[PDB]
Design an enzyme around this catalytic site. Sequence first.
Site, mmCIF file in Angstrom:
data_model
loop_
_atom_site.group_PDB
_atom_site.id
_atom_site.type_symbol
_atom_site.label_atom_id
_atom_site.label_comp_id
_atom_site.label_asym_id
_atom_site.label_seq_id
_atom_site.Cartn_x
_atom_site.Cartn_y
_atom_site.Cartn_z
ATOM 1 N N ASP A 139 0.993 -1.937 -0.387
ATOM 2 C CA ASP A 139 -0.193 0.042 0.442
ATOM 3 C C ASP A 139 0.894 0.761 0.071
ATOM 4 O OD1 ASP A 139 0.536 0.473 2.565
ATOM 5 O OD2 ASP A 139 -0.974 0.125 3.725
ATOM 6 N N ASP B 63 0.983 4.830 1.917
ATOM 7 C CA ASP B 63 -0.121 5.959 2.942
ATOM 8 C C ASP B 63 0.680 7.013 3.429
ATOM 9 O OD1 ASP B 63 0.100 2.757 4.479
ATOM 10 O OD2 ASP B 63 2.028 2.614 4.334
ATOM 11 N N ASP C 17 -4.087 4.555 2.473
ATOM 12 C CA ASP C 17 -4.433 4.954 3.901
ATOM 13 C C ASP C 17 -3.909 6.046 3.894
ATOM 14 O OD1 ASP C 17 -5.335 2.099 4.694
ATOM 15 O OD2 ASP C 17 -2.962 1.527 4.730
HETATM 16 N N1 LIG Z 1 -4.193 1.286 13.416
HETATM 17 C C1 LIG Z 1 -2.349 1.616 13.471
HETATM 18 N N2 LIG Z 1 -1.903 2.017 14.214
HETATM 19 C C2 LIG Z 1 -0.826 2.969 14.526
HETATM 20 N N3 LIG Z 1 0.254 2.623 13.563
HETATM 21 C C3 LIG Z 1 0.368 2.179 12.868
HETATM 22 C C4 LIG Z 1 -1.478 1.524 12.011
HETATM 23 N N4 LIG Z 1 -1.287 1.169 11.079
HETATM 24 C C5 LIG Z 1 -0.227 1.000 10.639
HETATM 25 N N5 LIG Z 1 0.866 1.696 11.195
HETATM 26 C C6 LIG Z 1 2.200 1.837 11.011
HETATM 27 O O1 LIG Z 1 2.389 2.336 9.656
HETATM 28 C C7 LIG Z 1 2.900 1.808 9.247
HETATM 29 C C8 LIG Z 1 2.764 1.189 7.695
HETATM 30 O O2 LIG Z 1 2.118 0.702 8.093
HETATM 31 P P1 LIG Z 1 1.584 -0.411 6.537
HETATM 32 O O3 LIG Z 1 1.079 0.571 5.497
HETATM 33 O O4 LIG Z 1 0.778 -1.537 7.386
HETATM 34 C C9 LIG Z 1 3.132 -2.012 6.686
HETATM 35 P P2 LIG Z 1 4.577 -0.330 6.089
HETATM 36 O O5 LIG Z 1 5.281 -0.450 7.080
HETATM 37 O O6 LIG Z 1 4.266 0.790 6.050
HETATM 38 O O7 LIG Z 1 4.702 -1.798 4.740
HETATM 39 P P3 LIG Z 1 3.583 -2.288 4.151
HETATM 40 O O8 LIG Z 1 2.740 -1.602 3.515
HETATM 41 O O9 LIG Z 1 4.303 -2.880 2.376
HETATM 42 O O10 LIG Z 1 3.604 -4.056 4.023
HETATM 43 C C10 LIG Z 1 3.995 0.380 9.820
HETATM 44 O O11 LIG Z 1 5.061 -0.029 9.725
HETATM 45 C C11 LIG Z 1 3.142 1.235 11.198
HETATM 46 O O12 LIG Z 1 3.840 1.304 12.530
HETATM 47 MG MG LIG Z 2 2.527 0.634 3.851
HETATM 48 MG MG LIG Z 3 -1.063 1.137 5.194
#
Ligand SMILES: Nc1ncnc2c1ncn2[C@@H]1O[C@H](COP(=O)(O)CP(=O)(O)OP(=O)(O)O)[C@@H](O)[C@H]1O
Ligand SMILES: [Mg+2]
Ligand SMILES: [Mg+2]
Length: 359
Positions: free
Chosen positions: A195, A197, A283
């Site tokens: 994703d 973010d 997100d």
């Molecule tokens: N509901 C929540 N509450 C607090 N922190 C959150 C959260 N959801 C995600 N995060 C944080 O936001 C970061 C990005 O979230 P993610 O998109 O879920 C995984 P990522 O580290 O970005 O790798 P990826 O998207 O390729 O799987 C995470 O590293 C985590 O610290």
């Molecule tokens: Mg992510």
């Molecule tokens: Mg995310």
Amino acid sequence: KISQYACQRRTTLNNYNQLFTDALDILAENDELRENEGSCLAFMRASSVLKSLPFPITSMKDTEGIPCLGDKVKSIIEGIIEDGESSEAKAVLNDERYKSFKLFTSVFGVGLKTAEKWFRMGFRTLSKIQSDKSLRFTQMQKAGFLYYEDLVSCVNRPEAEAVSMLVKEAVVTFLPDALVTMTGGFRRGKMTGHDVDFLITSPEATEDEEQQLLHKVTDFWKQQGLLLYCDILESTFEKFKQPSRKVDALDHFQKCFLILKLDHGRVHSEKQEGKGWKAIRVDLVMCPYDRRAFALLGWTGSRQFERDLRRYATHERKMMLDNHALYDRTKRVFLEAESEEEIFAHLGLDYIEPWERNA
Ligand SMILES: Nc1ncnc2c1ncn2[C@@H]1O[C@H](COP(=O)(O)CP(=O)(O)OP(=O)(O)O)[C@@H](O)[C@H]1O
Ligand SMILES: [Mg+2]
Ligand SMILES: [Mg+2]
Ligand code: NA
């Protein structure tokens, strides 16, 4: 001397111990599935510390002085040095429950409970799940199956940048002073992600303007025919509540989980080919301006880096940290920060760059 805390280590994407950490990550994931939280944590901490090493382990002597490496973990490292493989991780990869859980949760909208339910019903393939005439799917799962091939292919940096442009263009239409920051894996230097973010904040927006922005931006995309999926979670943020005591702190900011239609023409890559667009998981998080540094730090990750930051704050500094604030229990005051650097300085930590938080 290597610290037991990921927030006191620099962990970059040049992992010299992927043979060990891929095996430890599989074992940790299986312990999560088998509801063994303790064994899961031990494998995650061991994997995390080996990811920080500037050299590959080539003998058991190389593990001397490395923290978070218990007897169980050292047996696994020994076996990988012996044969180049982990028999323990290989048995998990061949386990029917593990294979089903990985396959079913690869669908957007499918968590542990639904994956377990389908497995106990006798399902083993996504084809048999999708074509079943008795199963009932949530709106999230329907989108997960409809855009499966696009969502399972990795979002790359040209695509993430194209999404950033779309987010910024939509956001400044309603809040021209808003600051939009790409967080998560891409902010940590990753080439790919599941994703994209973003953290959105505005120095002059009111409480109501802040609340309405994600609704305005998603209605705009719905009008453009770009909104493939949308779920907005209203804020439960409390300005004067103490930060979370939990191991895994919950985020109370207004946020939305989306699927956007990304037209190929917007992507400036080395490489129309098919339908001419790609479904992208996005997100968005909206936070009050004064809490932007805490939210950026929490949303940048990695998950292990966040866990250890909060654990260090509590056990070493008697401070309470989460995505919204930093509270000093000794001074009995909330600590302010305009940047991540100021948060690290409040905690008595050397600043760790985002690309060094891949714990
Ligand atoms: N509901 C929540 N509450 C607090 N922190 C959150 C959260 N959801 C995600 N995060 C944080 O936001 C970061 C990005 O979230 P993610 O998109 O879920 C995984 P990522 O580290 O970005 O790798 P990826 O998207 O390729 O799987 C995470 O590293 C985590 O610290
Ligand atoms: Mg992510
Ligand atoms: Mg995310
Ligand atoms: Na899932």
